[PDB]
Amino acid sequence: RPFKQRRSFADRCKEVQQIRDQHPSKIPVIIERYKGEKQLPVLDKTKFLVPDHVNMSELVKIIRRRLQLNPTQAFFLLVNQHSMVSVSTPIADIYEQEKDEDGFLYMVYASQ
After folding, report:
1. Where Phosphoserine occurs, residue numbers?
2. Distances (CA, A) of 41 to 31, 33, 46, 80, 89
3. What letters, b where the CB count within 10 A reaches 16 and e where it falls short, cover 48-82?
4. How many domains does the chain have?
5. How far is CA 64 from the centre of its chain?
6. Is residue 31 within a helix (H) or strand (E), and if so which, with residue range?
């Protein structure tokens, strides 16, 4: 089930804050599969802490690994309102610019 439907807005704020208060150098990112995707698998992990010094290329690289992709597989990692951000764009720039009302940063992966 979608993370937003698995935890109440109340619950979610609280996690984000607990993350802030316990791991202040990490960005809280929720990563999930695009709703209408077929050719790419559901991952066991949806909650990701991402070192705030990195950029989008790092994330694209972690998700490849977890999805067990091969170089050939081009995929899209889209933030928030299906936005494409530069892979050079640092996640901390991305976070401030695109984070949800609940403190998390939501992304989805897709292909084609």
Report:
1. 8
2. 13, 8, 12, 20, 26
3. bebeeeebbeebeebbbeebebeeeeebbbbbeee
4. 1
5. 13
6. strand 26-33
